[PDB]
Write a protein that binds this DNA or RNA. Sequence first.
DNA 1: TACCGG
DNA 2: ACCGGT
Length: 173
Amino acid sequence: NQLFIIGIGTGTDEYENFEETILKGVKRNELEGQIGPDILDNCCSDVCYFWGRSKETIYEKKIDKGDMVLFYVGKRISRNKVDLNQETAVYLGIICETVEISENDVSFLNDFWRKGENFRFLMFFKKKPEKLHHSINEINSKLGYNPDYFPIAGYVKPERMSGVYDILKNILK
DNA sequence: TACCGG
DNA sequence: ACCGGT
């Protein structure tokens, strides 16, 4: 029951990859024989929604099923700050399963990702991660972060989690 | 800055 | 340990 944040800067290849596999998604036939039939059955419909990283962990925390990912989307200004003057977005996904791809098998990841082979630690999301109506500053504030906190990949100290309990609850039914 | 370290 | 910097 952990919570992570992943910052997707607009106008960059991470945003492009975020378009393809989280916003648009990938038909499950184009994944058959690269991802297990069981992951495909239980985490995907005709479409899989998934993200990936180059390590298995985030601040030494590994990501497992049941956990949550807030994708912050906006124009990045400094390493971990966003421009609050242009549009921002927050999406919430719930991890279904995580799968590691072997380094002699990362070929297929380039089919839909720019430099995809570098990101062989995949995460699959039970349903398509949901676009919240909150801005990044509105979510940051609920978690006790600076308005423009925009981590590239952050772990949210559990004691902050209760500030967004309303939202996650409302999402389940 | 596909984030860690101190 | 998490943020919050350049």
